[PDB]
Amino acid sequence: DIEERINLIAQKPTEEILTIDRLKQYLEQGIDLNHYIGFEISGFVHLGTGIISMLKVRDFQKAKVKTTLFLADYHSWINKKLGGDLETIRKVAKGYFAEALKVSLKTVGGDPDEVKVVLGSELYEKLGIEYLENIIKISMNTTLNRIKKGITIMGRKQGESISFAQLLYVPMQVADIYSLNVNLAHGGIDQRKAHVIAIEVSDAFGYKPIAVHHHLLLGMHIDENIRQKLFEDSVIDIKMSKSKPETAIFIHDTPEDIRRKIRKAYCPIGEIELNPIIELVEYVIYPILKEPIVIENKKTHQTMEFDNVEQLKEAYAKKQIHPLDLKEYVAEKLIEILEPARKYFLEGKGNKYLEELKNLQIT
């Protein structure tokens, strides 16, 4: 069973695990894996922040680990998110953002009742001094350059204007992992540097936490020629974010919005290296539902069935699949998947949080 668990933790949404041997030792000795993932409360919940993260949380639940959803309200308050008002960030956390992550977990096929939602302020108040001690013990075993290099954890460049709270962010995040006795730290690949610092200070806590980083799902508009020829990739990268609404596919977007956003997305004829459409197939659609991928051509009336995403990338490199039919298949699949979440947020209980907590606070 052990290998099935590792495969289950190191599945397709996973991009990198540090380290697979440490995870093997942690299962050989019967050790119990605690997991959380940090979420800055910023903007609506889209596919990259919600679906793929919950795809991993569910994959962790099947692997019989403990899962936890962490709402870092202080980390968002440092980055001046949602107007910089702490009370505003706290409601979206306790209200809109938590219910958004739980319905996304149920949508991808997880149990929202089995995971634990922990707010940052309540955790720091519960521990009290132990949190500040962990911060100092981390800061005593790390350098300023390492913290000044781990700015990409929050999605900010090294050249952008700074504040000492943004530097304090990094030991605070490392303190979050140690405070919750988390053995399996999880997040995006942009959250790698802070997790590496956590392993570097395991001497002051008694255990090395294993870091798992999923694939940062890539936005629809990479039509801008940010050609990457080689810090360089970390700064100039662009992904599905919240300042850019038209390139973002939120879990509560109208089917018309999903169609018009998928349609205007970047999709070359045979290119696969940076296609935002096949990435939705590889990291969102197929991981949610593993049934064979069927696209329906127009010019030829035959359907086109592939057992797995590798055969799709084969056929797309051979220019056998027209981009409009792949786009129309992705849009329809995303509509059928998100429709439960859309009903909650637009037609059911979720409307109170989405309509007011997020929009009303916006000036």
Added chain:
Amino acid sequence: DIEERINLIAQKPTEEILTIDRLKQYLEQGIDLNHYIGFEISGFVHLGTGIISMLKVRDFQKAKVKTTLFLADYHSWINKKLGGDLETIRKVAKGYFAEALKVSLKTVGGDPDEVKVVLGSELYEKLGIEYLENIIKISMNTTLNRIKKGITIMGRKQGESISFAQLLYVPMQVADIYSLNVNLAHGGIDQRKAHVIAIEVSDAFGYKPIAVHHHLLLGMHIDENIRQKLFEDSVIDIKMSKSKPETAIFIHDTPEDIRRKIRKAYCPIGEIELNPIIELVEYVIYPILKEPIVIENKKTHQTMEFDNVEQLKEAYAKKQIHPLDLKEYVAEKLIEILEPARKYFLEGKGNKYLEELKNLQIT
């Protein structure tokens, strides 16, 4: 009476007050002045750390302000003081260091029962979240360069090896002032930068704290030619410290030790600009007891009476006072002043803390 209070807060041990107008506005409106002074628990208590600081605490008590002695155990634990063990630093604080500052306050002529001794850990545990919030609010309104320049608060150079906890020291000290609602921040002139940062973040706390900095009492051995020709003064300065025992006059030193340390001290013939002996007269002896300064020459059998330290510096510039007679007068005066403290620490209750808490912990 107002001017008598300002004179009483801005007396000879005071080197600089920021700002005298702000202190005048704070007394014109009847505002109440809260005071603390931070103490890293490091080494024995000598004249610079104990006597002159308590001379100001007593001067503050006469000015009818509230006084508080703060034992920054986390700040010493960051600087790896006393072996870096938190529990060891906590006992000297609760035991040796607190009783040392209180008997020094009673020696200079203050009330040890009127001041409040506050430990850092107990304060941070009492406030809990409010302390961490204040730290973030300070760090959000300050830059990294300002914190990277305020390293001299703990007595460390910019070029020396660093740790992120030493940088976090500075917003923590600013958070100490705001957490205790301190309107009159007090310390050495080396503690000026952190107090300036506190005024710079008064926007996030609702009041500008007034900073008072006393004269850093200067060590016996400045015979080394650290000639200062112009950061430069802050790095290369040398003062009465605890790594250098022979240049330090502790409050519990044997009269033989005080004599042999005063005797080998630096004392030019007519120079006054850097004489460690006249500084003991100007900032220690005369402020404690304001009776006319009487030195007794040997070659001429006449005594030499001066109303105040300015006339001493006049006569010393005229080479009318031989350095051995000034040294023998300073040594005898320091012996008669510290003898109450010596009895407590060497012959009375203080021996248990001094003999064991400090020496036993040393390996």
